[PDB]
């Protein structure tokens, strides 16, 4: 089946200053395809994981904030833009997932904190975490 494909670049400034504890969430602004499909999406990150078993990781999800019909099927890909402006450390759905309004899908163990937070690895230029999300909605 064909798709409508779109993207959002989320810059989280002053990332080293995040005070989020395990289970606390930051949501992005809402975004859409611009195809007037009435779908609104956002990203959400847990800097210290969804739960105790994931507290060593950032957990990253795509949330369907509002939709007109009962269900949407969509593939998704998340990557980090490094200091050289290139995509790295990407994770992508192996198939389309079924979203309804208020449902998310993503990666509970998206990136290990001990790796991300070491500035020498080039993922927090200017103390900014920049995430790039591509969404493909199945038509």
């Amino acid at each position: 089946h064909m798709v409508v494909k779109f993207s959002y670049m989320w810059t989280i400034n002053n990332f080293s200053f995040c005070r989020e504890e395990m289970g606390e969430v930051i949501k992005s602004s809402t975004f859409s395809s611009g195809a007037n499909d009435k779908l609104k999406w956002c990203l959400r990150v847990n800097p210290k994981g969804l739960d105790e078993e994931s507290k060593d990781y950032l957990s990253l999800y795509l949330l369907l904030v509002s939709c007109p019909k009962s269900e949407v099927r969509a593939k998704f890909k998340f990557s980090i833009l490094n200091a050289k402006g290139e995509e790295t450390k990407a994770m992508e759905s192996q198939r389309a997932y079924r979203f309804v309004q208020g449902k998310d899908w993503g990666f509970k163990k998206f990136i290990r904190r001990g790796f991300l937070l070491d500035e020498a690895n080039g993922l927090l230029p200017d103390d900014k975490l920049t995430l790039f999300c591509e969404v493909s909605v199945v038509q």
């Binding site: 957990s59 998704f76 994770m91 997932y97 449902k103 998310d104 899908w105 993503g106 990666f107 163990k109």
Partner: peptide, 8 residues
């Protein structure tokens, strides 16, 4: 390889 999941 990681698999996708939902927070709910």
């Amino acid at each position: 390889t990681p698999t996708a999941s939902s927070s709910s």
